[PDB]
Structure 1
């Protein structure tokens, strides 16, 4: 399932506890249309790939995490492996989302 991140401390902790696993972070905003459209698919993905950690960060709630991750478009997906960012793209592209997961897993 998707983990809801509500603090910078929580973001760091989850990245740390992911250990070996790939972390996919969804940076969204409630006003963004595309973000709402792709949410169900993003959740479906967390149920399909249990060997991958799925994170959700609302930019309004965590402006500090948003800023530090240099997010500028919505939605933005950032991929992390052992605390290091290994991928990133923006736009609600379903195929590309799953496709990128299969490349970095």
Structure 2
């Protein structure tokens, strides 16, 4: 299902509890429209891909996660698996989430 990260502590725990399924992270700003404007897609895949783990991060209130990931543009899609990174891509591209997930699925 989906899982919100409020601090770096929940970040690592998210990957550990994410099991071995894919893990896509949405680095969108809650106060920014253009970023949150794409949540109806990323979060929607939650019901279309119940076999995938989706996370959420606040690049403004969780600068700790964005700092470690050095995010400089939102939304930033980052893919993790077993606590390891396998791919990543930013830019409003909700349709790409489909091809990317089916790729490293």
TM-score normalised by the chain length of structure 1: 0.93
Moved over 3 A (4+): none
Q: Secondary structure at the match of 2:61?
A: coil
Superposition CA RMSD, Å: 1.1
Q: CA deviation at 1:7?
A: 1.0
Where structure 1 has 5 or more consecutive residues not aligned to the other structure, the ranges are none
Q: CA deviation at 1:33?
A: 3.1
Count of aligned pairs? 105
Q: CA deviation at 1:59?
A: 0.8
For 1:17 and 1:26, how far apart are their aligned partners in 2? 17
Q: Determine if contact 1:34/1:91 at 8 Å carries over to the other structure.
A: no
Where structure 2 has 5 or more consecutive residues not aligned to the other structure, the ranges are none
TM-score normalised by the chain length of structure 2: 0.93
Q: CA deviation at 1:27?
A: 0.4
Q: Secondary structure at the match of 2:44?
A: helix
Q: CA deviation at 1:95?
A: 1.2
For 2:33 and 2:8, how far apart are their aligned partners in 1? 25
